[PDB]
Amino acid sequence: VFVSNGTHWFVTQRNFYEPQIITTDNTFVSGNCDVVIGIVNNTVYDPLQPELDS
Amino acid sequence: FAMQMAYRFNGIGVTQNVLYENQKLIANQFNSAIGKIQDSLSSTASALG
């Protein structure tokens, strides 16, 4: 589930707080922003880009 | 409550996007179905048999 400490956005297990940096490994795409009530503008990290840049 | 129902869907193997991308429709189906409970219970004494 998504959470913020107040400044940064994390994803965590539902039953024990373990904040992970949000990536396309933790998260699945669907549709576009318009349809979801209460969606938030944020950054998702892409683990492949530094590996291609290196 | 929308994030609870997204877990309720996840618990039947229906992925969470099937909830938020239909949220108003799911809310209206719940509200309409709740409306039919009043009419069902009000109309016949046989339901509490």
UniProtKB/Swiss-Prot annotation, chain A:
Glycans are attached at N5, N41. This is Spike protein S2'. Changing D25H: In strain: Alpha/B.1.1.7. The chain holds residues 1094 to 1147 of 1273 of the full protein. The gene is S. It comes from the Viruses. Changing H8Y: In strain: Theta/P.3. Subunit of the fusion protein that is processed upon entry into the host cell. Mediates fusion of the virion and cellular membranes by functioning as a class I viral fusion protein. Contains a viral fusion peptide that is unmasked after S2 cleavage. This cleavage can occur at the cell membrane by host TMPRSS2 or during endocytosis by host CSTL. In either case, this triggers an extensive and irreversible conformational change that leads to fusion of the viral envelope with the cellular cytoplasmic membrane, releasing viral genomic RNA into the host cell cytoplasm.
